[PDB]
Structure formats: structure tokens, C-alpha cells
Ligand binder design. Sequence first.
Ligand SMILES: [Zn+2]
Length: 230
Amino acid sequence: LTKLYYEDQYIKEFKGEIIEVKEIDGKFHVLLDQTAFFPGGGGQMGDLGLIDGIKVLDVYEEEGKVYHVLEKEPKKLKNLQCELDWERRFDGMQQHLGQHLLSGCFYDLFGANTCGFHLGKEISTVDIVGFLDEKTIREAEKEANRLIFENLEVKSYAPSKKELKKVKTRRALPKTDEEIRIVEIVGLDLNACCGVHPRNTRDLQVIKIRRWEKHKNATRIEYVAGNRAV
Ligand SMILES: [Zn+2]
């Protein structure tokens, strides 16, 4: 069945048909024929919103199937108006690409590698290998914002096994039964990622580095992108 979030990440309203209903203590876990509700992936949180005016409280994936936890019992089940909480969606889209952008700027400018990231509701972090002084950190922040306004294309795709052999990456790709998705900041960076990203760097608006500290062999950098930064 259909996962719309990987086909067009900007779809915020869609038509759906409830294929299954399971009542699990108070809540109604539903399957849909097609969904734009992201369950979560690559560190990024899942969606909330409405299915037929009934609030979606949780979205998860189990055995390749996206399940929606509804607070009330579905009545009508065909041709339903389904809408994402777009503010939540887009916030997570911006923070994730924000991380990729910074990571790509740190490597492009200074050869500095990323070894971790965290996307939280309040703040997000990225870990860069080694000590970094304030000068280099602020230069990466500047360059990130420069490429936002340069508006680079961000391609999200699942390569065919033919075109997957011509994919050049700096980190080895996972061994999986699942399909490899690629997120590519055109001209800057190309990484395997299951996230849902904006289609350009301009969509980030602005990126601000808040503060940083040492974490073992790394510099843990706190950042905000988009509406969080203002
Ligand atoms: Zn990612």
C-alpha cells in the first residue's frame, strides 16, 4: 500500500480509505490505502493530524505498514478527508535538512566529519569529530545560511539497483532488505537517509547555531532552523 510522504513530501491533505480497524484499549489503530502520515525514521519524529475529523494521536510502522492511532471510533470509512498537522511536519523537515546542511558545510570547508545527531522537539544537535574553535563554527553557520540563500536543490529518491551502483558516497551503505533512500544536497552532500526533507535549501529560511560543548571526542553543536530560529 501507498506511502505518499516518499512520493511528494509537500502533500498536506489527501483522500484515504480505512482498510483495517483494531481497538486497543480506548484507541482505534487504523490502516489506510494510502497515507501521507510519516511514522518516523532516520531520527525524525512522526506525524499527527486528522482523519475524517478524528485526531491522529500516534503514527507508527509495523511490518511495512503504517498504523494511525485515532482517539475516536471511525464511522465512515471511504473517501475520507485526511490532513496533516503541517506545522509539526515542516518543523521536523527543516531541523533534519538543517543538520544535513551543517554537516555538509563542516566537511566541505574544514574536512570535519559528523559522528552523531539528535532531533528533539525543543532543540536539535549535531556532533562534529574533534575540537572546534568559535571562528570555524561561525564560518560554517555563515556558509550554511549562504547556501540557503543560494537555494540548492535537495533530491530525495530511492535509486534503482542499476543507478545505485553509480551512487558515490563517503560512508558505506547499509546492508538491508529494505530499499536504500538517498538524500542529496545538489553540489554539496549525498547521504543515505530515511528522513522526509524539503526539496530545496531556501525552505530552511535561516539556520542559527545556539551554543556548543565538548562531548567525548566530539563537539556537540545545538542548532535551530526555520521557525525555531526566529
Ligand atoms: Zn538524515
